[PDB]
Amino acid sequence: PASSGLTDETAFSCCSDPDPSTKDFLLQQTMLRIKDPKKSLDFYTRVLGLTLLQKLDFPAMKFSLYFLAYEDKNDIPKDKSEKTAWTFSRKATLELTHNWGTEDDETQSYHNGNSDPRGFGHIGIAVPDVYSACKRFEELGVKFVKKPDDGKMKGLAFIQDPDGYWIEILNPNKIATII
Amino acid sequence: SSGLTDETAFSCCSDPDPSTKDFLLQQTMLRIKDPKKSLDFYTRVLGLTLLQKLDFPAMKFSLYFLAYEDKNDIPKDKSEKTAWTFSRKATLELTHNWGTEDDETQSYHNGNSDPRGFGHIGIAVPDVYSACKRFEELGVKFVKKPDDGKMKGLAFIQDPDGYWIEILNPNKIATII
Numbered sequence: 001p002a003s004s005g006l007t008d009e010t011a012f013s014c015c016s017d018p019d020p021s022t023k024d025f026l027l028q029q030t031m032l033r034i035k036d037p038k039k040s041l042d043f044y045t046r047v048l049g050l051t052l053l054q055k056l057d058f059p060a061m062k063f064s065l066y067f068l069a070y071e072d073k074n075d076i077p078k079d080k081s082e083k084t085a086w087t088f089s090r091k092a093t094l095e096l097t098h099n100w101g102t103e104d105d106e107t108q109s110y111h112n113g114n115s116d117p118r119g120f121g122h123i124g125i126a127v128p129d130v131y132s133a134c135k136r137f138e139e140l141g142v143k144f145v146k147k148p149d150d151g152k153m154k155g156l157a158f159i160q161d162p163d164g165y166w167i168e169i170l171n172p173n174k175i176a177t178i179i
Numbered sequence: 180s181s182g183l184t185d186e187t188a189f190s191c192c193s194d195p196d197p198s199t200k201d202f203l204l205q206q207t208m209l210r211i212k213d214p215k216k217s218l219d220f221y222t223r224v225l226g227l228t229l230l231q232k233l234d235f236p237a238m239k240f241s242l243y244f245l246a247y248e249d250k251n252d253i254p255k256d257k258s259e260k261t262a263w264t265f266s267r268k269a270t271l272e273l274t275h276n277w278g279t280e281d282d283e284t285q286s287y288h289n290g291n292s293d294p295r296g297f298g299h300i301g302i303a304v305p306d307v308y309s310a311c312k313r314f315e316e317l318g319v320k321f322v323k324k325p326d327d328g329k330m331k332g333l334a335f336i337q338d339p340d341g342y343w344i345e346i347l348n349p350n351k352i353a354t355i356i
């Protein structure tokens with residue numbers, strides 16, 4: 001017969017315990033290409049409150065990388081080598097990739113993964129209060145894909161960044177409510 | 180061209196608003212064709228733990244949450260488990276739309292060919308060369324071997340959907356830059 005999703009039993013049976021060699025692995029980054037770092041940096045820092053950990057430039061290859069994360073800026077090492085080893089050992093960073101010149105091209109944009117052809121869906125941020133977070137987002141001119149009370153899943157939002165990537169806004173202590 | 184100067188970049192950065200103080204970067208969502216290949220890949224090859232599984236029969240999809248977390252840390256009772264899962268940093272939400280697994284004319288787009296957007300997720304590891312040795316041994320497909328290309332000591336592998344996963348050592352990137 002055709003799909004009905006895996007039962008917990010089938011799902012749970014596909015799960016292995018971590019091999020000891022993987023014990024110090026961490027999920028360090030999600031990389032997204034960005035058209036204009038001026039817009040993106042302003043959005044991710046001012047709207048969402050993330051910090052720029054490091055900027056890396058690769059002139060020969062004509063791109064820059066910007067690493068953003070929820071980290072205290074006073075924790076960032078000043079020295080470029082110690083900064084680099086710190087940035088790349090932090091959990092949950094965003095690597096924003098700037099291919100030089102895209103900001104000047106008015107016919108160029110990246111694809112957000114949510115229309116054909118689909119793949120990547122979104123990043124997601126946990127906040128203590130979705131409704132107050134989104135009220136602030138609204139006051140700052142943030143574009144919404146889904147307002148918190150819109151649609152089936154009440155109490156949950158999606159906003160877009162300056163490239164159009166979707167960002168889920170959720171409250172971990174109330175997700176239990178909205179099945 | 181020539182990129183942003185540090186002064187231009189840094190000048191676009193605001194200090195965080197206090198209302199954002201408890202925000203955390205909780206998930207990256209990827210759509211997956213076959214949850215069987217994927218759970219196997221991410222748990223066994225990569226060593227992540229399945230925190231939780233969610234089903235939405237009305238909409239015909241399931242969500243699988245994976246993260247590097249000790250399973251003995253997972254709340255046993257089903258309600259508080261969810262609030263734990265959704266408060267962990269750096270989880271992967273894998274989205275399975277029912278039926279894609281049986282379809283041979285379907286695959287998802289990895290973001291690295293036209294039209295580009297998403298690039299990859301990235302895993303920091305203590306030793307890239309032994310990790311990739313183990314990966315080779317389990318039959319993992321590579322996009323870039325660690326010694327392949329200019330940037331030595333850094334690898335890209337593919338998951339069962341074709342998404343790229345960077346494999347890196349934070350203490351050797353400083354050398355690599």
Ligand SMILES: FC(F)(F)Oc1ccc(NC(=S)N2CCc3c([nH]c4ccccc34)C2)cc1
Pocket residue numbers: 099291295322323324327328329335
């Ligand atoms: F043109 C843009 F817009 F920049 O779009 C892109 C999109 C993706 C990339 N990155 C690619 S294509 N790869 C990563 C590293 C790598 C590839 N083959 C290899 C063979 C040997 C060693 C390393 C590699 C493939 C570079 C530029």
Ligand SMILES: [Zn+2]
Pocket residue numbers: 029031095299301345
């Ligand atoms: Zn990367």
Ligand SMILES: [Zn+2]
Pocket residue numbers: 122124168206208272
């Ligand atoms: Zn999500």
